[PDB]
Amino acid sequence: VKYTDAQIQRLREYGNGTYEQKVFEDLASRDAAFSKEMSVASTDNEKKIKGMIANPSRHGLTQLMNDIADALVAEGFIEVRTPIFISKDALARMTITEDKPLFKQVFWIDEKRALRPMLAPNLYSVMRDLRDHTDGPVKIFEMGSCFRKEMHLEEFTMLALGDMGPRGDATEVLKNYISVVMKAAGLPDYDLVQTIDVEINGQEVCSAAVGPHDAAHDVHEPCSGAGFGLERLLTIREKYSTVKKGGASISYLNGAKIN
């Protein structure tokens, strides 16, 4: 026997073990193991919360953001912050129009504005404007909340980075930026898949592309960028049993259930 579906959900509520691989000889031994792992999960959870209260730390998601950010600034990236609201026109220039599947996932605020589902539209705008002020390449990044109707969260934290202007072996430059982020995140082992996808054990954690060409302009600047889901990265690194425990929450705090 394995743990039942309901037992798996019960174990993952307070526990961060790997429960799905466990196998047993009969119901009696499944049930004995379940009772023991439930008790251990709950007591460990309680001790972890008592530890945060006793010795508070920066939030794990905030820490991950700072670790990546300082690595990117050291690589010459400017940090930007852009609004969570974006325009319908801005989405349509992203090709996210009434027919695209993502469009149905957009949270509208009024007839003309939405919560951003991605950072790219704002980031490309800022990169283009900064390039008006320099002869050299412009490298920027942003970390912030994005929203989609729905490892899926309705609110999730994206890291988006971009590099605009004269490059030189753009694909290798982008792969190096991915390396910088993944190593700074504490996840040095990953797979690149095909535009480039980053996977860990088959789970996508980043999508990146060279030359996402900006209908407003006949002639484009060379551009590269990459978008990472930070709750996914944190979940994988800390081995949390669901993606709902390491990010924003009123039930979980840094992996532990508070209620």
Added chain:
Amino acid sequence: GTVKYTDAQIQRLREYGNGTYEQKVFEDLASRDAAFSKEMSVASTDNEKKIKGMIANPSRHGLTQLMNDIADALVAEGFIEVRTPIFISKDALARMTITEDKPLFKQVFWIDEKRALRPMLAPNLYSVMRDLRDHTDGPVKIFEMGSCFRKEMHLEEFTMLALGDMGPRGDATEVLKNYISVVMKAAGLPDYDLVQEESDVYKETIDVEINGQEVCSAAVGPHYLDAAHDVHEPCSGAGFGLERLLTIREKYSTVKKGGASISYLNGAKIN
């Protein structure tokens, strides 16, 4: 003289300039207009220099840096940093006494019939604080920094720092004043006034004001609000506007330049 820059001229000067244009007086319209022309060119020169410096010396964002400076100070004092969802429920708003007939209710961005963008951090922080009380007999001290939203020194999206301290050791007002001091000093704004102000939600607040400008509202309770969140002990909290703090410290001429933007970056207009 008595002639000032026109309101339109002030807006034009502040678009790229961070000077103090509202102070200028002139003898006549000709002198006003000649000064305007000169100071518009200064403003755009200074703005371009700031942009070029940012490109030559990439850095963390000013708002992010302020957030880190204050957060590290609060963690050093034993505050837990929490992150909570931007979405909150209509019922959560009602427990704050933000119901259909209140003015703040009119400022809420609704996502659907039952959910809204949070206009304040208190609803989620009350929930987390109360749950953490189940795990300790001592003080419960938490803070969050994050975006709040209100239909509208006012932004529609702004970054609140909110802190809560439940079951403080000592007098709740004295403790609140001390943690306000920790924040303001860590923000680089050690000179400020505390002023009692009226509040629809809190009855009375203690506000932090710098030269008359509110940057924080804080309160002990009141009891009805605490009890609505199942809190039955001395409690206090405070909410700071981080863009307002940064604007005042960096002497930016509007509140739109130091936070999130696709036009401004750290005080400079990029378009």
